[PDB]
């Protein structure tokens, strides 16, 4: 139940959508999950972009589900 | 020159939004690719160009200019 | 050491995080600029001795960042 940090991956082509205009989408996901979500700035041509998630295990799992939900809306 | 340096640079005012990209994802990426910090002023005050401050080694600063040009050359 | 930018997990001592970041974030801003590496630090270690970081850059930049971070840690408090 202590806070922990996990690596996670999102599609490079969805990063802009995940963050959203004015960062409003990533602010929503962090609030809804109780997780800090930090996204790397560059994939260097690879298909995924690394993220660091920090929260309780329950919050981290929630953040993964919410990120997946955004990706599943596509572009 | 080897050391990091800072200079002024200009981009078209009408390209600023495109350069930054949704969620700032494009400007974050081109800074990482070039090694150059790219700070863009918030307002042109009616002028056609927007001022930017570029900080990096000369090689990084040149790279950033090339990447910015390539974005501008895609237009809208 | 391939050419492309890559992302690595890395760790710094929890008790050094403030010193690494520096007053007004000036130190971490500078070492990122010097190394060419984005250095993202998690906000909380949850009682563990190390704090997770994500380093993004070319292999050469990532190694430079590790050296600069080690140099700061080796100055201690």
Inter-chain CB proximity B28 and A21 less than 8 Å? no
Overall number of domains in chain B: 1
Tell me how crowded residue A16 is: count the other CB atoms within 10 A of its CB. Answer: 19
- Range of B76's domain? 1-76
**Reported resolution in A?**
1.8
CA dihedral C43, A36, A41, B55 (to 10 degrees): -40
- Closest chain B residue to C39 measured between Cα atoms? B32
- Chain A residues inside the 8 Å CB shell of B26: 16
In angstroms, what CA-CA distances link A5 with A35, A54, C68? 10, 4, 23
Cα(C33)–Cα(B56) distance, rounded to whole angstroms?
7
3-state SS of B15-53 is: HHHHHHCHHHHHHHHHHHHHCCEEEECCCCCCCCEEEEE
With contact defined as beta carbons under 8 Å apart, do A23 and A68 qualify?
no
Those residues whose C-beta lies under 8 Å from the C-beta of residue C4, and which sit 6 or more positions away, are A44, A45, A46, C58
Q: Are strands C6-13 and C50-57 parallel, antiparallel or unpaired?
A: antiparallel
Experimental method: X-ray
With contact defined as beta carbons under 8 Å apart, do C60 and A72 qualify?
no
Cα(C59)–Cα(A40) distance, rounded to whole angstroms?
15
Beta strands in C1-77 (DSSP E): 6-13, 38-41, 50-57
Domain CATH number, residue C26: 3.30.1370.10
3-state SS of chain A is: CCCEEEEEEEEHHHHHHHHCHHHHHHHHHHHHHCCEEEECCCCCCCCEEEEEEEECHHHHHHHHHHHHHHHCCCC
- Chain B residues inside the 8 Å CB shell of C61: 35
């Amino acid at each position: 139940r202590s806070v922990m940090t996990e690596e996670y991956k999102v599609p490079d082509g969805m990063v802009g959508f995940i963050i959203g205009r004015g960062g409003e989408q990533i602010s929503r996901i962090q609030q809804e999950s109780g997780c800090k979500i930090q996204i790397a700035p560059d994939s260097g041509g690879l298909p995924e972009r690394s993220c660091m998630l920090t929260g309780t295990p329950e919050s981290v799992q929630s953040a993964k589900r919410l990120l997946d939900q955004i990706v599943e809306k596509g572009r």
